[PDB]
Amino acid sequence: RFILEISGDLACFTRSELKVERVSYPVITPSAARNILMAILWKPAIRWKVLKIEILKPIQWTNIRRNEVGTKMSERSGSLYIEDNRQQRASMLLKDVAYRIHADFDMTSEAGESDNYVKFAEMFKRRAKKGQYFHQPYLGCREFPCDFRLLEKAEDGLPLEDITQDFGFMLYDMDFSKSDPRDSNNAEPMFYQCKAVNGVITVPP
Amino acid sequence: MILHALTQYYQRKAESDGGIAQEGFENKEIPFIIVIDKQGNFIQLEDTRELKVKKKVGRTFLVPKGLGRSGSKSYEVSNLLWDHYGYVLAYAGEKGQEQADKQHASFTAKVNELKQALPDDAGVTAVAAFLSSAEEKSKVMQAANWAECAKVKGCNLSFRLVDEAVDLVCQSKAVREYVSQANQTQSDNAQKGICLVTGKAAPIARLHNAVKGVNAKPAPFASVNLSAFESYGKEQGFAFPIGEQAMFEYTTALNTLLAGENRFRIGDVTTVCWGAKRAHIDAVKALYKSLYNGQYCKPDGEDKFYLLGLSPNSARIVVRFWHET
Amino acid sequence: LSESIAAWYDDLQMVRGENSPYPEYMPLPRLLGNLVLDGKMENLPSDLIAQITDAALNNRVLPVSLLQAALRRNKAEQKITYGRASLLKAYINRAIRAGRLKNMKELTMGLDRNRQDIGYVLGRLFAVLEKIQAEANPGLNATIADRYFGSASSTPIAVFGTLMRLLPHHLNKLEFEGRAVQLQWEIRQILEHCQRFPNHLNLEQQGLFAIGYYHETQFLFTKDALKNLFNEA
Amino acid sequence: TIEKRYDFVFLFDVQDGNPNGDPDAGNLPRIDPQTGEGLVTDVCLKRKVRNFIQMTQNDEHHDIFIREKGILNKTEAARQYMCSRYYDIRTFGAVMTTGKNAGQVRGPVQLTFSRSIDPIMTLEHSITRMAVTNEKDASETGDNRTMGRKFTVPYGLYRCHGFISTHFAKQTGFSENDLELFWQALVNMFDHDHSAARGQMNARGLYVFEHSNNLGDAPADSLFKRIQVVKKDGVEVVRSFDDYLVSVDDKNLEETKLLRKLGG
Amino acid sequence: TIEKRYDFVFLFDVQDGNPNGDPDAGNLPRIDPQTGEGLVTDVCLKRKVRNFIQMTQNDEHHDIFIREKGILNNLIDEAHEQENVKGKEKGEKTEAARQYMCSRYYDIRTFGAVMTTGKNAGQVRGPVQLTFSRSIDPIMTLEHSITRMAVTNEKDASETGDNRTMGRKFTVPYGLYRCHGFISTHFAKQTGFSENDLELFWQALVNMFDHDHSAARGQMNARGLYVFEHSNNLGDAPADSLFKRIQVVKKDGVEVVRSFDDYLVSVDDKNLEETKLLRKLGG
Amino acid sequence: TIEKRYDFVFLFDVQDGNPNGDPDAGNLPRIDPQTGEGLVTDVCLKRKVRNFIQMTQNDEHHDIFIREKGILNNLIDEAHEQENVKGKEKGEKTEAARQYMCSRYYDIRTFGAVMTTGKNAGQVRGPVQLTFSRSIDPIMTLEHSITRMAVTNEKDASETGDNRTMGRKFTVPYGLYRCHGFISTHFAKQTGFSENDLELFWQALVNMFDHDHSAARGQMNARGLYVFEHSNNLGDAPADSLFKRIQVVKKDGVEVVRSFDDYLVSVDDKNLEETKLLRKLGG
Amino acid sequence: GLDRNRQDIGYVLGRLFAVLEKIQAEANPGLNATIADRYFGSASSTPIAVFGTLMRLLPHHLNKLEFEGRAVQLQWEIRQILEHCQRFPNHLNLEQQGLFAIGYYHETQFLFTKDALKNLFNEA
């Protein structure tokens, strides 16, 4: 078990139902937390798994529209010209976000020789207490920072003290079972949370 | 919560009997309606317009949904018993012929195959013999109120037999079974999952239904119309793992709650406010009823839910309103 | 959710003077369309008119773009009628009740004869100036508002330093000394609550300016409340 | 190929124009609907970097791929060719139709949504045009007019964060020359690109911190809390740089980190 | 086609009138609602340059684009019947029309023109680009209203006594504005901004407030124009470091300003001799 | 039409009288509340020139725009009722009506007028553009008052026979106001300001107060009129390099001015004979 | 709301103009215009050209008064106000214009009060 105080400027957890309009999630997506944990420290033997999702700041939705292109880069066309395929998509942001997520790690099948638990635990602890990471984490989109800090129990306040409202179906994690390494085709299943008296809990498959 | 609550309140309103679709239907505005007899023969060109200060395209009727016609090949879609104004008479105002003849050919082939798949149904015989007689379509143009149909875009020409005057050609006790069977057979043999707002089976839905109510033309809501918005190369389909049933449900809900009493223009935008009922808020729905009468009180019945707000753009829809509290 | 609707509609009731063609509860479509340039087509349908619901009916705070567009439309039309003043009040009391503004108190449904603020007394001064000028000259093709509203809400010193030379002459142009002394007592009681004209009005003063302007305009356009207030001097 | 991590904060001020408009509501500058500070996106910074790279090169080994129409108009082998050719591939990663991880690469250069410190006031002056674009309703014999609106900012100071790691530069090919070109662009990307809407945008402080380790021996929170940009004492509202106050903290990063001031 | 980057600071002064009337507040000079300093739009300077060129040039290969008289669509459609009537394909006819306009129009080569409102005929980014001009001190708006002894049409104020229709024609006692402008190199390459157009733009910025006058703008003058030219198409120093080196300030014996004698200028031609060229055309 | 652009500075001394009273401030002369300097609108000078031309001309092809007796819509309809009624097409009929008004009406050829309220007829500009007058030294107005022995109506009277309505008459002790005016060339070619109109305007500028005298106008006189004429249509010299050559200031131990002897004026005519001509008409 | 110890030229100028207008209004009963309705155009712009003549004519207004104790109290308050003024500058700032207007209106509101000036003079 590890407590991560993920907090940055804004957030934009793009949902799976509305992919054209990057609407942000009310909290931190479990897939986003897994990607953050992989960007902080990951090896072809570890498997980051989220457990408890917590909230530390009230929701502040800001209407922001992003202007993108509608053509992918390839070896066929040399240039794309964004002025031709300009699309004014939506990307609602969440001003001032903070999450003290509780997540640990397990083991995979392609470990081999480096399959230690305490070694990876102390490595992640040192990386969180010193500032080492393979890539800067993202809060739904690679445009906001994540001032992660290894906490011991509780160090910040939460606004959701009592029962508020459930978020319904949330994107858990993409199915990586029936997929070769460096996958390119899978699904995105969702799941139900529980009671929101201080966040949401992620039920493992 | 964005699309899950839509299906939730759609299923809630479906069991309350309030004029809503039921597997393969949609409330679409039909301007001029061509009333005929039992075996063809153009009888009259009825019109049910005259609503508010703006003359709309008639009154809303429950007709089977379509697969969208936005694109270059708008004639290969082949709708059921209703489409555009040029899909029956094969005449266009600004588009000309050529493309209008193929649309009429596809329409008559579809109605012929529907009559062959479902014989002895009265309503299908009229629509099958009217498009193949090649003699009443010219008399339809030489009617009384035909000059007011080619002056506006998006005209819908529907059919209706006699001996009813209350039941449309697509509402008789014969085509509803085929419509319900088509949604449980054609839209259930694609993929296996995984769904989103339901979590069960529900195959992957392709080409979302066009939502009409905010743009001058019917445009889809959540549909990647290009290629730089897909996930891992889904090519319009697997990017949003939403089932066909839930897609139809939320599209029909958005189409119904954008023309009735829940439709109000905030400002260069057409949104809709409704509660969880178990709505009757009597504060936001009556935005432009009269002169804002005294209705806000404390009836110890403040419902929850949120306020969904859709807005037009350049090709798709943008969601701006998002607040649960 | 109905409590938010109630807390948004109860404060919407302005003073509303007599002979007003607008009701006490202006519809939201026209209220949000009064912020356009010229027609209901070109506006800001997101951070402005498409956010009043999320800001009021959901117990939230108003953005700063609201105040920006409000002052822009105030300096555009050079006047405030029943179509803009009902939106500036949703920033002061909605922020003081939660906690995001500063230290000043909220407002009221009537004309507050105290407060001891900056924008409110300045707006009331501008409104009584406009009313005195309107009572002086009958046919007015352009009032002092249409000339000084380019900086009445921004830099009050750049407009009130030149407006004090026209007010005594406008009062002398009147055909009645009783009404003149009544307006003098009223503007004296208005500007008594002030302290000094600042160099520039901050973001928490343009809304107060518009609110005070509309309140004083509708109060002096009632019937004979000015003489009744002057009788107890 | 670089071997050290670079964490930089870039302070840029727009003087008379729109730093970043809101596509949601017309074209008003991006501002926070809560604290009032400007929320300038990093896509404008990326566009400025691309334009500066196109200007200062105009040749091979430094192409833009995603260029502008109004400015100029097996797997590992193709990826290596795209990296060695286009500079945007080494900058913001590689994204083609084919590849390993679904043909996607993050990239070393990763900017941040610029957030202001003081609440600014967007000036929306609805100007009028003495002509007509098309055959609208106002294009009659009376007065061919098309009244619009101009959005400007009196003084908007924003701070953009950026992190460049050598782990991604080893695969994308971001060498020391590429880093020097990126710095030279960041110094004058707003000076080489101007318009009637963006106006005048200048630089203030390019505070860079180079770490000895390949992953970074210092968190980002302490690095952000070190450089403090606040207001003065008697200054009420912003107007120019003489009203702000920037305070650095070079007494704690003198152990292993190296400080660089390529702007002020 | 020029090969160097140019950064020009234009310090001018208006003695009377409105440098840029605001459509919102009638015709008031757009002062900053943050401290009271004026802000002149760049479109005003562009139109003044256009008027000066029309007064001086008005010939071939140097258009200006009309204003009120004459619809812009008449010229938009006319530009298509030149060297690309049909033998260019719609996929690239926009670039050909843009090049033709750059070779024909002068305002397009200096700034540009929007034609994508119906038929895409070009989209020049804009080499020479100017910003809004700020002031050092908060100008004090005078606001001098005016009246008329008669009425134009048949308004309600047209009685038997005297139809007094009033007007609002504001003025400024003294306003020292400091505009900034930038000319790159790639945009001049893609358009064709040669040295002749550069010298014409310099002469326009030197003299334009004296050739284009009216009743609302009053008296607008020009004081100085400090231009920094880079040694190539690079940037050896930021624009803020080079603009603040030549700074103006208020007088140390008075607060209000009424003429150029109430200001003090200061230059610094010491560290500017690296790889830059300093020129002064206005003063 | 003329082919040169003229820039004339006119310094006139108003002795005891109101030159241009403030409208919203009753009738006191417009002054600067930030320094105490005097101000005079250019529209007052335009009206004085119009009155002088009306007193001198009184002939055909030189309309002066009548007083209140006659709605301007009637004059607009009379100008339209000519050779451009219907068969002319409004597109160029507007310009034809503008040309007819410039050839007939003198106010439109000199300054200009608006003819787009009721019936449109184009938007002319005008070559002659005047600016607001400014006082060198801060004037100290007196603001006098008078009294009438009779009363207007019975409401403003007394209760028996003591008829008195007081009075007011704001006057100036002394004021040397300097104004600037510009005559272009492109607008002159569009209107029709030839040499005859130029000579008429010069006569008006050298004699404008001596003809248009009023009870509140006072003893206004003209002191100096210095005109700079350029040999070409381009910008030979900026306005600041030519207006500062006519330096006006106060004397030694003179706190308040009374006549022209206390105002030290110096014309710097040493470096301007390169391509510019100077003429002292009023001086 | 009146600051007696402002130590600013604008406030004392405003209070002086206010008490001058008050004496002018109290001099004659039935009047049509006061000194503020004629001299305000240059009262704050050129104070030396307005206040001088105002307080030079003020002896005649005091002679045309009715009560002597009221005139004594008015002169005492005028001197107490001018205590915070050392000279009359010919040029005034915009902030000084605003301070002048504020002080003038505050002094008018304070003087129009029934029981106030007498209570202030009681502690002299």
From TrEMBL, chain A:
NAD keyword on record: no
Highest taxon above the source species: Bacteria
Function: CRISPR (clustered regularly interspaced short palindromic repeat) is an adaptive immune system that provides protection against mobile genetic elements (viruses, transposable elements and conjugative plasmids). CRISPR clusters contain spacers, sequences complementary to antecedent mobile elements, and target invading nucleic acids. CRISPR clusters are transcribed and processed into CRISPR RNA (crRNA).
CDD domains reported for this sequence: Cas5_I-C
Keyword entries, A-Z: Antiviral defense, Endonuclease, Hydrolase, Nuclease, RNA-binding
GO molecular function, one term: hydrolase activity
One GO term (biological process): defense response to virus
Gene symbol of the encoding locus: cas5d
Record-linked InterPro entries: CRISPR-assoc_prot_Cas5, CRISPR-assoc_prot_Cas5_N, CRISPR-assoc_prot_Cas5d
This protein's name: pre-crRNA processing endonuclease
Pfam family, one: Cas_Cas5d
EC code: 3.1.-.-
Membership in a protein family: Belongs to the CRISPR-associated protein Cas5 family. Subtype I-C/Dvulg subfamily.
Enzyme type, top EC level: hydrolase
